[PDB]
Amino acid sequence: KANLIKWVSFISGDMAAFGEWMKGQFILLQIMDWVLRGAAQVMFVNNPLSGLIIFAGLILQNRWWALNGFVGTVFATISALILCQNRGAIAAGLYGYNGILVGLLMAVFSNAGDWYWWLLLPNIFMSMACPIVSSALASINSRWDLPVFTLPFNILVCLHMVATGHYNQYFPQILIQPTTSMSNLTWSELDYAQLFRSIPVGIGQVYGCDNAWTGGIFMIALFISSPITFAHATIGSAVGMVSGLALAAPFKNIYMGLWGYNCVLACIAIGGMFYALTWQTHLLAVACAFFCAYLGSAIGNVMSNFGLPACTWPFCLSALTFLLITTETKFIHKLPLAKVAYPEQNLRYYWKMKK
Amino acid sequence: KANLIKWVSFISGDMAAFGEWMKGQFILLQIMDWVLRGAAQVMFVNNPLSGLIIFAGLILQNRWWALNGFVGTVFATISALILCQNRGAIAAGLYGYNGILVGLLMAVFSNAGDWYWWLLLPNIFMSMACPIVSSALASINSRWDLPVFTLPFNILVCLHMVATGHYNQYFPQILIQPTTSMSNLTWSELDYAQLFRSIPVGIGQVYGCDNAWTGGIFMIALFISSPITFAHATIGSAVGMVSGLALAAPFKNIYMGLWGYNCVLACIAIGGMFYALTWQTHLLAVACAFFCAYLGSAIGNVMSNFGLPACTWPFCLSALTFLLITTETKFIHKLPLAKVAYPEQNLRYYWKMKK
Amino acid sequence: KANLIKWVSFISGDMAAFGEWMKGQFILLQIMDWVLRGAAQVMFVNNPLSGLIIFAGLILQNRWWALNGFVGTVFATISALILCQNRGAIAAGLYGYNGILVGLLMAVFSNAGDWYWWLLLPNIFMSMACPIVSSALASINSRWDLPVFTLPFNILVCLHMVATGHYNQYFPQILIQPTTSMSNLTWSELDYAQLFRSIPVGIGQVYGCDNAWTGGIFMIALFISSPITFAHATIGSAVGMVSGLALAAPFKNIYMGLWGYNCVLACIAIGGMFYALTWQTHLLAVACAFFCAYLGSAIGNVMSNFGLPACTWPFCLSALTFLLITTETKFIHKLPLAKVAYPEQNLRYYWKMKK
Ligand SMILES: CC(=O)Nc1ccc(NC(=O)c2ccc(C(C)=O)o2)cc1
Ligand SMILES: CC(=O)Nc1ccc(NC(=O)c2ccc(C(C)=O)o2)cc1
Ligand SMILES: CC(=O)Nc1ccc(NC(=O)c2ccc(C(C)=O)o2)cc1
Ligand SMILES: CC(=O)Nc1ccc(NC(=O)c2ccc(C(C)=O)o2)cc1
Ligand SMILES: CC(=O)Nc1ccc(NC(=O)c2ccc(C(C)=O)o2)cc1
Ligand SMILES: CC(=O)Nc1ccc(NC(=O)c2ccc(C(C)=O)o2)cc1
């Protein structure tokens, strides 16, 4: 009984005990810990165990994608080290999540086929640029006390697959053409099992995986760390589903969760992560999730002309917008960046402050 | 004699006496006053009477457009209230003009036809987002002491009609395709009555109305409040006309005032409104109006690829550029934002300061 | 012997002795000096003699292009004077390089043919807007202590040739269509003389000249002022060549140096000019040059949809990114803007500081 509770407290949330021990151990095993934490940080989670769960999901989805993600995040961490960035930040996985996203989405969008080893070569360079660009953004955004927010990934993944494009002999990408025909959406044709399955599929799309089992694995990883993040994740994916229904989105897109990943990320960040969890904050999170869906439709349409995907551009632009709003209410409380942690610590910090 | 003068002083400029009385009256009538002030604030005018004049013009142009504008501005005001934004700002109509523009231009660009009630549903949401985005912009721009400048509207109206597009089953928009053929502009074909009628048509296009009578109504509303704003309005529309002639613009576009609304807004703001009215400031306003026309040609061409209109993107980007320039002359005086009012108060404040 | 050394010291680097004398002489000859310094400032060089060398190269390439460049830079200087901008900045050519680039590239991209005198009319206006926009950018960027970096030129040249476009009756521009066919790049077809000749051709493309002799003239102008700038120039052009090979770029583009001008500018700025010259800084400069090539491929592809060129947008966005990165190493030292001069003075200032 007490043992199970102690174990639950230990694998929950940022592993403070595990993090304090790691400093002592060997450098390579530390690097592995930082890579795992960064792999979990896409979901705003600082849990190495959730990182192993995430990598299990990625291995389940596609082994080439998992390899690209691993090499991307490890080289992002190494580049953060060689540039002498803050090791508190590297050890918290704040520089590796951009790398894993870069690797995963270059694997996803590459038309060269599975096990195209040359794709590692840009995967390294874009990952090495994940720290640089991150710092370049942090400086601009630290003025308003806003986080970096996956913006580096976006710039890099787009910068790659607009520089190469579909008609590139070395690194071809998938053809993304803008919609030039009216779509006959039939409500009778809609399938509800797939619609309600879009929640895990959206949680999976956060990493680029379209498999529902991978999304369930991701939710398990979230619930190991923070139940608030899990709740806001499901709510964000549901908001994306409903919004896609409301904007006459093609059904196959809602089924594949392409309307959910931006919304889930927005709901995590604007819920517990940067704003103190209050009912006002939770409704702000749902509103930010709805806005984010519009951004996904918009940024998807505006970037389909360039042959580019809309990838996390929507979240950043929504979460940044909702983190910049100034109100006269003391219930929509914006946390300082250093103090920010998983939503439970944020809630405890908020409550102590008020007392 | 003295009575007419007193009445003129009272309906002129920000109605200080009317504003001080309103605080006392009932909440709903206050909301109506704030809605009317916001409707007049597109023209940078804080006059409720000019707001009634503007709504008369909108009713004259299209009753569906007027209804969408009214619902948009009322919901922008309500959203500003529920988010606990400054009531000095809401009472000055600084949160409702974006809403009325959103409603009007969604009505204008919707291909679903007149009296498409479902268009109210996005008209509400984009209007509710007018405060949020406004604050999101204000924070960034308050650092340089600049105004939001209708940027929220732009983001929202574009975000809508790039998310939906022409090929959307629920909210179709008009097809805006980029120019793919050379145009044979004939100077002999030019009609001068329509060219010189483009001044009121441009003042109308500020709100989306292409009717010359509506533009005359708008000028009457301006002259009730501030003659300087009226003069700069006519000058801006004329600058847009001349520039459109100078850039080989199609004649039908100049006739319909599509070259004037950005220029008139730029000339109002860079003339009396944010810069103290000096001959140097007035020439800066004319130069900003000319720049703005180039932006309209440019932003129109760059956004026609996305199927989007260029709507007020040009003004903001010009007025912001001309408000950021630093000179060593004390005659190009940039006013602080709180002190800014209608150009007559700005001139009086400037002159007192110098004395 | 001592005489040759004294002369070398005098035509080297910012001509401090010549600059101090000029203040005394007549206003028109001063204006000529400032125009020449601005013509040399595209290469980050404050040497009037290098300005004469640059204008000799431009006259060699195309006399229409040279005339447009001269009129653009002279009107940029005049506009900087009439707006009462800092004469320390005007006398250093910090306001004329944007003008010469605007004139040169409007001449380059105009489809109206050689000696189209009407092209002078926009060449004047865009040049007159070079100071305004410059100040508009400086204010934003002085907060982070970064330079304007030729961003004004970019905005203006693009703003022109997106406002006019290929199908414009008065100011037609060249057709730039996005790639819609796969290219069969053959390594056997590659010619090495042209590949290695791409270094001077890239240095020429910095000003828009595709002639190798003009590039050699430009390198001579650089070596008169600062050998470090010459070394970083050749290294940047070589990096652009190698990157273009690495991204499957068409061979004719690498031969014409279209992959080098952004890289050479990035390597100059991130090498000696704004960062103190250290081996860490030099590797940062090479990395910034490689990033810049990706930007050129990307910004070229993203802007080819609009019918626009990618012109120096890549450099600014790379140099700005690499100037915003914050590290914990004291060897990547960012110089303050006022202190910045040619790389030799930067190195001497750095070394004195450390002592
Ligand atoms: C002192 C300081 O600035 N600390 C600080 C800086 C940045 C962040 N941001 C994140 O952890 C983060 C942002 C976005 C994301 C994802 C995966 O979307 O993850 C937290 C704290
Ligand atoms: C016709 C068309 O627009 N297709 C299309 C649109 C958008 C995307 N984007 C994604 O699938 C995606 C998955 C995961 C991500 C992330 C989190 O970066 O981004 C692919 C294809
Ligand atoms: C303390 C403070 O920031 N006050 C303050 C803030 C914002 C504004 N801006 C406006 O009224 C405004 C800007 C643009 C427009 C339109 C319709 O174009 O109208 C004035 C004063
Ligand atoms: C082929 C093409 O580009 N057509 C095209 C271009 C631009 C517009 N924009 C407007 O009409 C407009 C009117 C009023 C407004 C405002 C103030 O927001 O914006 C429509 C159609
Ligand atoms: C006090 C202060 O801000 N000084 C200051 C301001 C701006 C610059 N920038 C340049 O000289 C410059 C930037 C970019 C370029 C080119 C041709 O690319 O040339 C230096 C010093
Ligand atoms: C199909 C296509 O993309 N063509 C294409 C692409 C890019 C350019 N840009 C330039 O040539 C250029 C030369 C010099 C400059 C500068 C320094 O401003 O910019 C032309 C044509």
mmCIF file with all atom_site columns, C-alpha atoms and ligand atoms in Angstrom, chain B residues 41-44 94 97 101 142 145-150 265 273-274 312 315 337-338 340, ligand 3:
data_model
loop_
_atom_site.group_PDB
_atom_site.id
_atom_site.type_symbol
_atom_site.label_atom_id
_atom_site.label_alt_id
_atom_site.label_comp_id
_atom_site.label_asym_id
_atom_site.label_entity_id
_atom_site.label_seq_id
_atom_site.pdbx_PDB_ins_code
_atom_site.Cartn_x
_atom_site.Cartn_y
_atom_site.Cartn_z
_atom_site.occupancy
_atom_site.B_iso_or_equiv
_atom_site.pdbx_formal_charge
_atom_site.auth_seq_id
_atom_site.auth_comp_id
_atom_site.auth_asym_id
_atom_site.auth_atom_id
_atom_site.pdbx_PDB_model_num
ATOM   1  C CA  . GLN B 1 41  ? -13.667 54.490 -34.276 1.00 0.00 ? 41  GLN B CA  1
ATOM   2  C CA  . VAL B 1 42  ? -12.771 52.832 -37.606 1.00 0.00 ? 42  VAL B CA  1
ATOM   3  C CA  . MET B 1 43  ? -12.425 56.416 -38.833 1.00 0.00 ? 43  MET B CA  1
ATOM   4  C CA  . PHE B 1 44  ? -10.469 57.262 -35.637 1.00 0.00 ? 44  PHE B CA  1
ATOM   5  C CA  . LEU B 1 94  ? -11.320 50.999 -28.839 1.00 0.00 ? 94  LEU B CA  1
ATOM   6  C CA  . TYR B 1 97  ? -14.231 48.893 -34.272 1.00 0.00 ? 97  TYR B CA  1
ATOM   7  C CA  . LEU B 1 101 ? -15.021 45.604 -39.384 1.00 0.00 ? 101 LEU B CA  1
ATOM   8  C CA  . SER B 1 142 ? 3.066   49.075 -26.093 1.00 0.00 ? 142 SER B CA  1
ATOM   9  C CA  . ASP B 1 145 ? 4.338   53.068 -27.624 1.00 0.00 ? 145 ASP B CA  1
ATOM   10 C CA  . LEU B 1 146 ? 2.421   52.333 -30.817 1.00 0.00 ? 146 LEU B CA  1
ATOM   11 C CA  . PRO B 1 147 ? -1.231  51.487 -31.282 1.00 0.00 ? 147 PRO B CA  1
ATOM   12 C CA  . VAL B 1 148 ? -2.844  48.188 -32.256 1.00 0.00 ? 148 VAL B CA  1
ATOM   13 C CA  . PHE B 1 149 ? -4.062  49.924 -35.450 1.00 0.00 ? 149 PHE B CA  1
ATOM   14 C CA  . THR B 1 150 ? -6.823  47.476 -36.530 1.00 0.00 ? 150 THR B CA  1
ATOM   15 C CA  . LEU B 1 265 ? -6.683  55.545 -42.772 1.00 0.00 ? 265 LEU B CA  1
ATOM   16 C CA  . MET B 1 273 ? -4.054  61.492 -34.626 1.00 0.00 ? 273 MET B CA  1
ATOM   17 C CA  . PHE B 1 274 ? -0.681  60.182 -33.337 1.00 0.00 ? 274 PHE B CA  1
ATOM   18 C CA  . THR B 1 312 ? -6.213  47.100 -43.870 1.00 0.00 ? 312 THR B CA  1
ATOM   19 C CA  . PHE B 1 315 ? -2.488  50.815 -43.316 1.00 0.00 ? 315 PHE B CA  1
ATOM   20 C CA  . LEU B 1 337 ? -0.741  56.968 -26.577 1.00 0.00 ? 337 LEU B CA  1
ATOM   21 C CA  . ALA B 1 338 ? -2.763  57.952 -23.500 1.00 0.00 ? 338 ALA B CA  1
ATOM   22 C CA  . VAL B 1 340 ? -3.813  60.903 -28.046 1.00 0.00 ? 340 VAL B CA  1
HETATM 23 C C1  . LIG D 2 .   ? -2.680  53.776 -23.207 1.00 0.00 ? 3   LIG D C1  1
HETATM 24 C C2  . LIG D 2 .   ? -2.944  53.366 -24.644 1.00 0.00 ? 3   LIG D C2  1
HETATM 25 O O1  . LIG D 2 .   ? -2.280  52.510 -25.120 1.00 0.00 ? 3   LIG D O1  1
HETATM 26 N N1  . LIG D 2 .   ? -3.994  54.048 -25.374 1.00 0.00 ? 3   LIG D N1  1
HETATM 27 C C3  . LIG D 2 .   ? -4.384  53.799 -26.735 1.00 0.00 ? 3   LIG D C3  1
HETATM 28 C C4  . LIG D 2 .   ? -4.321  52.411 -27.355 1.00 0.00 ? 3   LIG D C4  1
HETATM 29 C C5  . LIG D 2 .   ? -4.752  52.191 -28.789 1.00 0.00 ? 3   LIG D C5  1
HETATM 30 C C6  . LIG D 2 .   ? -5.272  53.359 -29.601 1.00 0.00 ? 3   LIG D C6  1
HETATM 31 N N2  . LIG D 2 .   ? -5.656  53.073 -30.955 1.00 0.00 ? 3   LIG D N2  1
HETATM 32 C C7  . LIG D 2 .   ? -6.886  53.468 -31.593 1.00 0.00 ? 3   LIG D C7  1
HETATM 33 O O2  . LIG D 2 .   ? -7.744  54.101 -31.088 1.00 0.00 ? 3   LIG D O2  1
HETATM 34 C C8  . LIG D 2 .   ? -6.976  52.988 -33.012 1.00 0.00 ? 3   LIG D C8  1
HETATM 35 C C9  . LIG D 2 .   ? -5.887  52.403 -33.594 1.00 0.00 ? 3   LIG D C9  1
HETATM 36 C C10 . LIG D 2 .   ? -6.241  52.075 -34.844 1.00 0.00 ? 3   LIG D C10 1
HETATM 37 C C11 . LIG D 2 .   ? -7.538  52.438 -35.019 1.00 0.00 ? 3   LIG D C11 1
HETATM 38 C C12 . LIG D 2 .   ? -8.243  52.220 -36.326 1.00 0.00 ? 3   LIG D C12 1
HETATM 39 C C13 . LIG D 2 .   ? -9.736  52.149 -36.338 1.00 0.00 ? 3   LIG D C13 1
HETATM 40 O O3  . LIG D 2 .   ? -7.634  52.098 -37.324 1.00 0.00 ? 3   LIG D O3  1
HETATM 41 O O4  . LIG D 2 .   ? -8.011  53.018 -33.882 1.00 0.00 ? 3   LIG D O4  1
HETATM 42 C C14 . LIG D 2 .   ? -5.348  54.752 -29.000 1.00 0.00 ? 3   LIG D C14 1
HETATM 43 C C15 . LIG D 2 .   ? -4.908  54.967 -27.560 1.00 0.00 ? 3   LIG D C15 1
#
